[PDB]
Amino acid sequence: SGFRKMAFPSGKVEGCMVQVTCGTTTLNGLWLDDVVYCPRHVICTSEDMLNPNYEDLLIRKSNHNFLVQAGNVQLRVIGHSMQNCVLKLKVDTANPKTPKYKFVRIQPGQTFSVLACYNGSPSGVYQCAMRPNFTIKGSFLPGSCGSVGFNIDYDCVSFCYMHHMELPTGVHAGTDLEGNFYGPFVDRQTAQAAGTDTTITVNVLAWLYAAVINGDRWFLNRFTTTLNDFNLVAMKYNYEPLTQDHVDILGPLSAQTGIAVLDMCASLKELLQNGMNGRTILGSALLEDEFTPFDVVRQCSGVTF
Amino acid sequence: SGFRKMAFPSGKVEGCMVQVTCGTTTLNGLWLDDVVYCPRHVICTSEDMLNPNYEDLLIRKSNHNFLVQAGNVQLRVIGHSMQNCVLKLKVDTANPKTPKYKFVRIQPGQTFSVLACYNGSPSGVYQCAMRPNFTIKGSFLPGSCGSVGFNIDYDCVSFCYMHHMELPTGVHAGTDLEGNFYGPFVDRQTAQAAGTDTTITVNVLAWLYAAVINGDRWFLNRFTTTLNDFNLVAMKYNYEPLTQDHVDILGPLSAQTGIAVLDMCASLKELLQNGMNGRTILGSALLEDEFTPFDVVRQCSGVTF
Ligand SMILES: *[C@@](O)(CO)[C@H](C[C@@H]1CCNC1=O)NC(=O)[C@H](CC(C)C)NC(=O)c1cc2c(OC)cccc2[nH]1
Numbered sequence: 001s002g003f004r005k006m007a008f009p010s011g012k013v014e015g016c017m018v019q020v021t022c023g024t025t026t027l028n029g030l031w032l033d034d035v036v037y038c039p040r041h042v043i044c045t046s047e048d049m050l051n052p053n054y055e056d057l058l059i060r061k062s063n064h065n066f067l068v069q070a071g072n073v074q075l076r077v078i079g080h081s082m083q084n085c086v087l088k089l090k091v092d093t094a095n096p097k098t099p100k101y102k103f104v105r106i107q108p109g110q111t112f113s114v115l116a117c118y119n120g121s122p123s124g125v126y127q128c129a130m131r132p133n134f135t136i137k138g139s140f141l142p143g144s145c146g147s148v149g150f151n152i153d154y155d156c157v158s159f160c161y162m163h164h165m166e167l168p169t170g171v172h173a174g175t176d177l178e179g180n181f182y183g184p185f186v187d188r189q190t191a192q193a194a195g196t197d198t199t200i201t202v203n204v205l206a207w208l209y210a211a212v213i214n215g216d217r218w219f220l221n222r223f224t225t226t227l228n229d230f231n232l233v234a235m236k237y238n239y240e241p242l243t244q245d246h247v248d249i250l251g252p253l254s255a256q257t258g259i260a261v262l263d264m265c266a267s268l269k270e271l272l273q274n275g276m277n278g279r280t281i282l283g284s285a286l287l288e289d290e291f292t293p294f295d296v297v298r299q300c301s302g303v304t305f
Numbered sequence: 306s307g308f309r310k311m312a313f314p315s316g317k318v319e320g321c322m323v324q325v326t327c328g329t330t331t332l333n334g335l336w337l338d339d340v341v342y343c344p345r346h347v348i349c350t351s352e353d354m355l356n357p358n359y360e361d362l363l364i365r366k367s368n369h370n371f372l373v374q375a376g377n378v379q380l381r382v383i384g385h386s387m388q389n390c391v392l393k394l395k396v397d398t399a400n401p402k403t404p405k406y407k408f409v410r411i412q413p414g415q416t417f418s419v420l421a422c423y424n425g426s427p428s429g430v431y432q433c434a435m436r437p438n439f440t441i442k443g444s445f446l447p448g449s450c451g452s453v454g455f456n457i458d459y460d461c462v463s464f465c466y467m468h469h470m471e472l473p474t475g476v477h478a479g480t481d482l483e484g485n486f487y488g489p490f491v492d493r494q495t496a497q498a499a500g501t502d503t504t505i506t507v508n509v510l511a512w513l514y515a516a517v518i519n520g521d522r523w524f525l526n527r528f529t530t531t532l533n534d535f536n537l538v539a540m541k542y543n544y545e546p547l548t549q550d551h552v553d554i555l556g557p558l559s560a561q562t563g564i565a566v567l568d569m570c571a572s573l574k575e576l577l578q579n580g581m582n583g584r585t586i587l588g589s590a591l592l593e594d595e596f597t598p599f600d601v602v603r604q605c606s607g608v609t610f
């Protein structure tokens with residue numbers, strides 16, 4: 001039993017974390033096979049960051065301009081290409097620690113593990129969720145650019161995020177491993193705001209099932225609601241609408257506890273209208289939306305990786 | 306910026322997790338060099354765990370009664386012995402992924418990272434804190450015995466916890482890597498109850514320092530107390546008394562903010578006596594206690610490994 005914010009074991013990613021230096025800028029790279037992936041603004045100077053023409057700046061660079069570091073071993077760049085905001089540095093040596101990998105673009109509401117890195121060395125691992133406004137509530141310091149977000153299925157690591165910047169509100173934005181930004185953000189040194197951030201509803205419902213599975217039942221009530229009537233109240237409190245797919249995903253959680261999904265919705269409806277009155281749920285004074293139904297099932301059901 | 310629970314990179318510990326089977330019972334083991342460490346109750350069947358005589362059970366066990374597997378590959382046991390509640394199995398092969406390691410016994414309040422494992426395959430990693438009643442509020446499922454808790458100091462990995470059981474209350478208990486239980490618990494199929502939990506006072510002070518390092522400093526009292534006077538008032542609110550390593554460990558955080566430890570102690574006593582009056586600190590208004598002063602230094606500074 002128990003329920004913690006759990007990230008995937010990071011060992012498969014640590015073997016790919018390298019250091020990419022170009023000029024006087026240093027960030028992190030992901031060394032898969034004979035390619036090294038890193039944010040493209042490593043090639044930028046301090047003056048270039050304001051308004052960078054990247055294909056312009058990239059054409060003015062060469063292979064020997066990039067300093068790639070893997071441990072205490074300098075990796076030689078034998079070629080360079082650019083895919084959106086991601087730089088691709090081909091090297092002479094392949095990574096023996098390359099796992100089975102894939103490049104996916106997660107949908108908002110999904111979760112992934114972040115391996116915070118500085119100068120190509122892993123600092124810490126933690127779990128994030130892609131918020132509906134395509135930002136993440138991460139923990140990043142200058143030099144964390146190039147850190148990747150990931151999920152592991154069987155022995156396959158599915159990369160989905162690369163860190164790029166920090167918004168003025170403390171949240172963070174980045175790209176997938178193809179270079180496409182999550183959200184309306186761009187890789188320039190400007191103050192960028194995001195859209196209004198809604199609450200991932202189906203994540204809150206799975207979190208409540210996790211509390212019931214762990215013996216916390218103070219929030220349940222003897223009422224039920226229709227899917228539309230719940231979405232009507234949920235929309236009023238800036239919650240994403242619950243879909244028939246979301247209800248289907250919560251199926252196993254409803255089966256284990258015997259509480260219908262539409263029953264849990266009446267509890268979340270009550271919680272939004274009345275508050276928690278100073279009590280806690282799973283030790284939290286707030287409604288938590290950073291756990292997917294899989295995250296709860298993989299913990300509470302007993303699934304292992 | 307961004308502050309959240311952050312676990313150590315689990316790669317170095319991943320390469321030390323193995324499977325230990327005795328008859329029909331399977332748990333997890335820690336393989337460092339040519340010795341595998343695991344809970345001693347692996348030599349038990351279902352009815353053996355009720356009232357086990359561990360010295361009498363080990364006398365009827367041989368080296369070939371032990372199945373040690375790295376993945377699916379078996380490591381032959383060339384020697385077995387017992388230290389308290391852990392089992393030591395000498396293996397014919399030395400682990401090439403063995404890092405520089407240590408066996409340490411941590412104090413209630415210190416944090417570590419748990420790498421949850423099932424059948425020798427790491428499942429997830431999360432940060433825990435040792436509660437003052439010597440339990441941990443973990444997240445374990447059947448087959449998780451042998452999962453280790455650890456801290457990383459530079460290139461050294463310090464092992465400090467080996468999981469053993471789950472209390473009726475939902476929390477968990479275990480031993481260090483020397484076999485000695487944390488608390489008054491024993492490895493048996495017995496209903497065991499921990500003592501009354503308290504708040505890790507040194508950890509809320511580091512968290513208040515973490516808030517001061519950022520924006521929130523609204524709770525600064527401009528008052529002081531003696532170490533003795535605060536300890537007497539803190540115990541009246543189910544808070545742990547401050548020891549000596551507590552005051553000295555808060556040193557770097559006090560020098561960074563210029564706010565003395567005893568000055569911060571009076572700010573916290575003001576928050577215990579009159580509450581927070583609907584004000585929030587670092588987001589959640591719940592007085593977090595699972596961040597050590599190192600967790601603040603390590604996160605706010607970007608210490609890598
Ligand atoms: C990378 O590590 C550098 O390659 C760095 C990581 C973030 C900054 C510190 N903490 C982080 O998460 N990324 C940046 O510094 C980026 C630069 C590229 C072009 C994206 N810039 C920002 O994150 C940034 C710039 C500004 C700003 O200007 C003006 C004004 C307000 C906020 C802001 N964030």
Ligand SMILES: *[C@@](O)(CO)[C@H](C[C@@H]1CCNC1=O)NC(=O)[C@H](CC(C)C)NC(=O)c1cc2c(OC)cccc2[nH]1
Pocket residue numbers: 001331332346354445446447448449450469470471472473477491492493494495496497
């Ligand atoms: C290990 O996997 C056993 O190898 C197992 C892990 C716990 C069980 C599931 N989740 C866990 O954290 N450990 C145990 O089963 C131990 C075995 C002891 C050390 C011999 N037992 C318990 O954790 C346990 C026993 C009892 C109990 O009795 C009956 C009554 C109430 C709670 C309880 N927990």
